[PDB]
Design a protein around this nucleic acid. Structure first.
Lengths: 87, 144, 70, 62, 150, 129
RNA sequence: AGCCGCGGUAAUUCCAGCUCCAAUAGCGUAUAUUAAAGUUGUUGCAGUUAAAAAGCUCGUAGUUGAACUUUGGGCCCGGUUGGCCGGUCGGAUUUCCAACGGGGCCUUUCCUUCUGGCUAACCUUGAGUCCUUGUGGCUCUUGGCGAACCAGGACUUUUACUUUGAAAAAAUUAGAGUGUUCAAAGCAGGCGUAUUGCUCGAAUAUAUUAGCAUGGAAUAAUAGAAUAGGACGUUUGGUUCUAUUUUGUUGGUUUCUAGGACCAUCGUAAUGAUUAAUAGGGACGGUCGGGGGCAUAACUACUGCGAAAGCAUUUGCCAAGGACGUUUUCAUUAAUCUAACCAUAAACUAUGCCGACUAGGGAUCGGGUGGUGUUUUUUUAAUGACCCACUCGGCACCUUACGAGAAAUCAAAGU
RNA sequence: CGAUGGUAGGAUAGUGGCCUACCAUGGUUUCAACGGGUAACGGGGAAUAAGGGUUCGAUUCCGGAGAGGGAGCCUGAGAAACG
């Protein structure tokens, strides 16, 4: 949101979920956010780099969380052959 | 589906049910039947003049208890009779009789668990002179 | 809708009527009596067109001018 | 906008408020009248414009 | 959901997708259109024809192998019955309960299963009269129960 | 029994987007379903969709993003005049700068801004935000 | 002292003194009506326990009713907007861009035509006209036409809705202009030399049912060829009816000719019938049940059947009915079926009822399809029982709750 | 004892069951006819108002009716008139 002149005039833009594109507010106290570690050519881990996933409050309560991890992670090449579209 | 019809050519059921059970609104039924003439002692008027039969003393039974002073009267346009009320000559000293008086109503509804009992009217002037002009003593009752 | 008189018939017309508070329609109808020349042959159930002339009877002001069958 | 009733009845309402001096001369836009206040008319009476212009020592001497 | 009942099942045949003949048909339309009339002279309904045709001579649907339906074929060759077939079967069902009633009288039950069967006939008869395959003075009655088929 | 086909072809959508799914299955299709969908697709509210056909009246499989709050239907399709769009739009829609109510109008099915600059009017059909 | 109430001495309200508050010309009291009132509910209420779903199924009028029949592609003109451009002794824009609406043609494809003038325009026998010389057009002459306008037509399903127009008195209502000294009003007024003057006004909007004129073809109805008396033909035979014309003219005749309809058969078109609803009815095959009528307890819940009240000994008759199975068939959806008792069972009540969708869990009852699994044995294939897994239909039960609720609670009492 | 239509007359400024003769048997109705109430003259308009609406209109303008209650007619272009 921005005025006639052009500057943003919210307080501060909030975080969308990543499995269902909802919006996570300041009292969604089950809204997990999870990092994984990039890897090295020798087989070690860079201490400073991540890949970040944000999951909403209610994809976890129904129990649909871990499958939504496997769907999300496998697009980024983390896994192979553990999730399948045509169920 | 709400239990009422929604379709487009349905305006006749909708308007004939509404005036059908509009007869439970309590003071729309009073207005179309016109019970203001057939039952009310005034007939539909603000004030009314009568002529006083006699002094009465009435009392209030449960929790309250004191000495409420009222008055009989007989209306000129009608012949029927009612019992009015006169406000706070609590000294017991303004009996008056065979006089012309002007009544009014209370802004009426009440609580008679203390039994401030079943009268409906009051008195605003007597023999051509206001009541408060005598209580605040600005006139005195006209006679020769 | 009726051909039981001698040289007159009765026409039924149908419309709808709008009630603004309820935003809807309701059906109505009106019957008109007209006159039939013996040039035409009209049985019940047909659909005619009719035009207006000066007062013919107590209750008549139209007579048929075309006809199309059922 | 560009609706000829907005342009004829707007630019007359604006023009009358400036001509008595309530709208500011840089606030000639139609949204700016929706935040006008009640003492912006109270400061244009003769009781108030004669005390400010130095003729009476108080607002009750006006 | 079953008019004049309260059951809710669903079980019909499911028509296959292709609108052509199967590849395991080795006949002609002329060599099959006449077996229909060869059993019409035996006095059969369309209903008995097709089930006899399917279970014996392998025609899946006369609708697709010949260009027409069964009743259209029968109407063109003049073998058509007078009263339409479904309506006739409700009539014949209605007399068999009626014939039971001349021998029984202490059945308050099956009295009120006949007013249901008769009710489906006026529903059928309005439609057939309106589309005009029955003449507009066809009416059913208890006297015409024992008249037109009986 | 089944009276409106569109009215529960949009009841199948938001009933399975309140639970955060991504795709739904509609049955039967219609000529007025598809054009209602094609105006929630040129505005971004849904993704893409496919039309089955099975020789009766086909099914549809739609792909939902994340962006619908509600889509609906108005069931007597009343007769909107032209001075009366803006009373229908001040009641159905959450704010003055987004959302749409769509109309069947003599020059096609369209939304309510698109009907302003073509200067037409018609019967109401539904809303979307 | 409207309504909760304050009195039983001295009262944080009666009766009076003092000091404060509110409006200032009191809205003080009475009676009607409007808002408050989602307590009349189209927008927009109330389903179990709070007022409130009729004893039960068939069925009038009324309301409401599945999907489908011209989409797409290509070219081209001309709108005002975001604009580049300002070029400047804000307005041009040489000039291009993005959108946004509009024409136009072509694609198997829109007014359906006819006769006349009639006007411009292509052209015909052919030059005038004047420009490189022309059947060049422009336009002259004969002649083919489309082309603008009048006039006769000529025939062609019918509505609902919506767009724009004419026509809905003034006063009043929204409202433009205008120092009645401001205002409510009014329709006035303003300017010079005031010396014989010129001069601006008295607008505009408000279809708000029915009728009238007009644009569009979505939505929802309606008609058309099935025994073809169907449509097109300059196939041919007919039967009629009019005489406008010419035989100056007139009346007395009929010859054609045009001009009306109807009458057989002879020719060409691809000759002409929407699917088959996880809507409904109808057949068909094997079954199931304390369903009903005539005759002759235990099993009773864990669950069976019937529209409801209700329904238990075997045997046989008479008809009815749900579900399942199927590559059969047709093209459907609302007038209100001892007796009589006294209530002496918190005497559980805001459920066309049909339809779509939304989380788990295991037991049981019908029908069907599977399986190297068993075992009576015919044999560890199979008949045969079991067993396992799926599947469509049934009355019930246990979980949770995103949801709903005043709560108890509820897979609907949710969306 | 005209209710709905047909044919011919009478009467009127004139059409018409407006009235009279002979004949036909029609016309209105659950889309509410016919009857009952109205402390009911109709509209332009009025009060309240987010939107939809609820309640009023005897009363300055236009239309109808009346002159104590019913009926009848004279003069006139025009009245069933009440100065």
């Amino acid at each position: 949101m921005e005025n006639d002149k052009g500057q943003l005039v919210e307080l501060y833009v909030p975080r969308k979920c990543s499995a269902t594109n909802r919006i996570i507010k300041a009292d969604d106290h089950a809204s997990v956010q999870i990092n994984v570690a990039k890897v090295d050519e020798e087989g070690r881990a860079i201490p400073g780099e991540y890949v970040t996933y944000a999951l909403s409050g209610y994809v976890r309560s129904r129990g649909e969380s871990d499958d939504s991890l496997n769907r999300l992670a496998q697009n980024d090449g983390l896994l192979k052959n553990v999730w399948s579209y045509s169920r | 589906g709400k239990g009422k019809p929604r379709g487009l050519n349905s305006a006749r059921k909708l308007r004939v049910h509404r005036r059908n059970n509009r007869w439970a609104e309590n003071n729309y039924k009073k207005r179309l039947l016109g019970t203001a003439f057939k039952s009310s002692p005034f007939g539909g008027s603000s004030h009314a003049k009568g002529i006083v039969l006699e002094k009465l003393g009435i009392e209030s039974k449960q929790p309250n208890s004191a000495i409420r002073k009222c008055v009989r009267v007989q209306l000129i346009k009608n012949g029927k009779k009612v019992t009015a009320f006169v406000p706070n000559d609590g000294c017991l000293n303004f009996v008056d009789e065979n006089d012309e008086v002007l009544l009014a109503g209370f802004g009426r509804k009440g609580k008679a668990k203390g039994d401030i009992p079943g009268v409906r009217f009051k008195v605003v002037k007597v023999s051509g002179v206001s009541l408060l002009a005598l209580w605040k003593e600005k006139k005195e009752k006209p006679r020769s | 809708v009726s051909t039981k008189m001698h040289r007159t018939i009765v026409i039924r017309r149908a419309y709808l009527h709008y009630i603004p508070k309820y935003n809807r329609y309701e059906k109505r109808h009106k019957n008109v009596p007209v006159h039939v020349s013996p040039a035409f042959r009209v049985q019940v159930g047909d659909i005619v067109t009719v035009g207006q002339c000066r007062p013919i009877s107590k209750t008549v002001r139209f007579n048929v001018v075309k006809v199309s069958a059922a | 906008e560009k609706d000829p009733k907005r342009l004829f009845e707007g630019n007359a309402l604006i023009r009358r408020l400036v001509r008595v001096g309530v709208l500011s001369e840089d606030k000639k836009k139609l949204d700016y009248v929706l935040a006008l206040k009640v003492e912006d008319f109270l400061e244009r009476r003769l009781q108030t414009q004669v005390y400010k212009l130095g003729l009476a020592k108080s607002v009750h001497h006006a | 959901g079953r008019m004049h009942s309260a059951g809710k099942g669903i079980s019909s045949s499911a028509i296959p997708y292709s609108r052509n003949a199967p590849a395991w048909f080795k006949l002609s339309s002329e060599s099959v259109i006449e077996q229909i009339v060869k059993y019409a002279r035996k006095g059969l309904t369309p209903s008995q024809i097709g089930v006899l045709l399917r279970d014996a001579h392998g025609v899946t649907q006369a609708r697709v192998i010949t260009g027409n339906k069964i009743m259209r074929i029968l109407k063109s060759n003049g073998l058509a019955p007078e009263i339409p077939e479904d309506l006739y079967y409700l009539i014949k069902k209605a007399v068999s309960v009626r014939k039971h009633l001349e021998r029984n009288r202490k059945d308050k039950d099956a009295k009120f299963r006949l007013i249901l069967i008769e009710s489906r006939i006026h529903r059928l008869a309005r439609y057939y009269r309106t589309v005009a395959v029955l003449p507009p003075n066809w009416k059913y009655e208890s006297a015409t129960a024992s008249a037109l088929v009986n | 029994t089944r009276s409106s086909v569109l009215a529960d072809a949009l009841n199948a959508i938001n009933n399975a987007e309140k639970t955060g799914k991504r795709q739904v299955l509609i049955r039967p299709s219609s000529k007025v379903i598809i054009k209602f969908l094609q105006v929630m697709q040129k505005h971004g509210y849904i993704g893409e969709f496919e039309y089955i056909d099975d020789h009766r009246s086909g099914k549809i499989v739609v792909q939902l993003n994340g962006r619908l709050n509600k889509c609906g239907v108005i069931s007597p399709r009343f007769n909107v005049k032209i001075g009366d769009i803006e009373k229908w739009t001040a009641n159905l829609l959450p704010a003055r700068q987004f959302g749409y109510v769509i109309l069947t109008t003599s020059a096609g099915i369209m939304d309510h801004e698109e009907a302003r600059r073509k200067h037409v009017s018609g019967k109401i059909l539904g809303f979307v935000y």
